[PDB]
Amino acid sequence: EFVEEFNRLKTFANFPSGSPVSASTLARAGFLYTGEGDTVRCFSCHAAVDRWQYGDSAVGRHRKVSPNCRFINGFYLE
Ligand SMILES: [Zn+2]
Numbered sequence: 001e002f003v004e005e006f007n008r009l010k011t012f013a014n015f016p017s018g019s020p021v022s023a024s025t026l027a028r029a030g031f032l033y034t035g036e037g038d039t040v041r042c043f044s045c046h047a048a049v050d051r052w053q054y055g056d057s058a059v060g061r062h063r064k065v066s067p068n069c070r071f072i073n074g075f076y077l078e
Contacts, residue, residue, distance in 0.1 A: 002043040003076055008032055020054040029058035030071040044076070045069035 002008050011033040012023035019038050026033075031040035031049070039050035047066040063072050070076060 002032065003078075008043060011035075019052050021052045021056050021058055025058045029062050030069070031058065031062070042066065042069060042071065044071040 005027050008031065009023060009027035012027065013033070014035065015023045015033050016038050023033070026040055030042050030044060032043050033040055034048065037050055038052050039048055041048040042062060045066045045068075047062075047069070049061055049065055059072065062069065066072070
């Protein structure tokens with residue numbers, strides 16, 4: 001259901017314009033938008049990450065936060 005990138009990106013409906021990190025970048029990293037702030041949450045491991053900054057890596061932060069997530073370890077790559 002959220003295994004496809006595009007379905008995740010449809011959660012970024014009201015995502016703060018001018019977030020240092022874009023909704024695409026975050027959708028690619030496996031993240032859904034919570035609808036609050038710039039707070040997102042990974043669809044597989046359910047970890048949330050907010051407070052995005054210039055030069056952040058969506059993938060990097062996601063791994064840092066949850067290094068054993070099924071998605072970022074490629075277990076969803078079709
Ligand atoms: Zn995850």
